[PDB]
Write a protein that binds this ligand. Sequence first.
Ligand code: CL
Ligand code: CL
Ligand code: MN
Ligand code: MN
Lengths: 274, 274
Amino acid sequence: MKYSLCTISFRHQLISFTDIVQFAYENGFEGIELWGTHAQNLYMQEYETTERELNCLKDKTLEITMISDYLDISLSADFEKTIEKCEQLAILANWFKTNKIRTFAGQKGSADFSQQERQEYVNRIRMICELFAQHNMYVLLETHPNTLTDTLPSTLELLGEVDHPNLKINLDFLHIWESGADPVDSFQQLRPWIQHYHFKNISSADYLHVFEPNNVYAAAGNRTGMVPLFEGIVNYDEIIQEVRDTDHFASLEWFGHNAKDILKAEMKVLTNRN
Amino acid sequence: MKYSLCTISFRHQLISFTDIVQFAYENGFEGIELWGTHAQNLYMQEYETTERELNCLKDKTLEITMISDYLDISLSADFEKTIEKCEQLAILANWFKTNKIRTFAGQKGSADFSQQERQEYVNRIRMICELFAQHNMYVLLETHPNTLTDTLPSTLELLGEVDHPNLKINLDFLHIWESGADPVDSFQQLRPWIQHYHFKNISSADYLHVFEPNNVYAAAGNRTGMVPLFEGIVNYDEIIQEVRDTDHFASLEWFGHNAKDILKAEMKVLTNRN
Ligand SMILES: [Cl-]
Ligand SMILES: [Cl-]
Ligand SMILES: [Mn+2]
Ligand SMILES: [Mn+2]
């Protein structure tokens, strides 16, 4: 299958886009999943250096797989401001040559929505899908705890409620496993909507809270329990056997220390495992 | 006075240390306040490129003013792990040639400590001071809401309770103003302990919550109300008149968008204002 690197793995170190691309290339990645804030800042302040890089990506068998961001469609949100952000993301996706935008479906668990709140959010996701459909771009909701996609049945339900051809899924197997669902079974049920994967692992359920966004974004955040794919509790042998003959990128979503060492080691094992 | 740039201003963009140093130099900064995670990652993965930069800093009238980090000395903390982090920070400070480490005094407001919790934290700050004193390095507590330094009297009290020669203050005037204290008066009272400043401003008290750490660290975090120094509610004319003939660096602590544009514009006004 095709592996991608996420620039979010480098959120706590000083490194240039040029050096990320070179690292991706020399380690056999075929894609880069570009964090939205990185995309935006390259466009504003590194436009020429970035354009030169983009013009050789293809020569290195690299591409931008997706831009991964956060669209606020909560009731408290200034929705016109969210729409303006979508329009800027479509500009960035055009420049980076990607047709996918990752977002999250809400900021609390499905069980905590009233049927009325869940209705208003379905309508807003639909609106965002119709905006991106003009640009022939897909909106991928990531499967995540504390969102509407925090369980397999809620995710399936959401997809049926929005009922739009440009709404797709970024399947994050760790979070799917966390919800109590079987990873292969979730893949099989979500297959018609999947366009991308996230692969990460944890040593034990005891440490799942290290993936809470606030902990992930904090420089001094806890990394205990974050482990390479074949060294954690989720069974990546079974997952990769299922997904390896789909066409979608799987990002190695590493949030721990020493990203380059971990990523480099991961790719050697991924290419050679049985 | 002497101005420094904080690498934390660049936490949401891909940029190299070499480009930060060059930007600092061409805009008349005389110092760089290096975020601890940036320092650590340069040491692990960019040691040669960083060493070459460090060897010309002096030629550019630049230096590393401080490494700014987070030491967990709460009761829930693994304190031996905190001590190990201090030992690594002393290694980094040696390499970067700085004698200052910024930390925060606790993770909740002074009013929320029992006299017993506050005692245990005083003892731990004292221990950290004694560790860094071996390396002839100073521990600077930053004045911050939701910490023991959230008011001027609590900060003064803390300094008297620890009573160690290596405990110093990083005076963040915005947060001091937020606490209800007068900035110039706080400078005058805290003067014997001050070794560094942070300068940032806000358009109105209504927007002070945008400085909450979780909001600051999040890529999609709100930046509304963050404004250049002379365009906000805190009076930087009065502050700079007081502090301009001290020897301490003042960092332009910008957490908003377009850091390079904002910082470049700031330095032109700072050099030329009356
Ligand atoms: Cl540019
Ligand atoms: Cl190195
Ligand atoms: Mn993910
Ligand atoms: Mn500050």
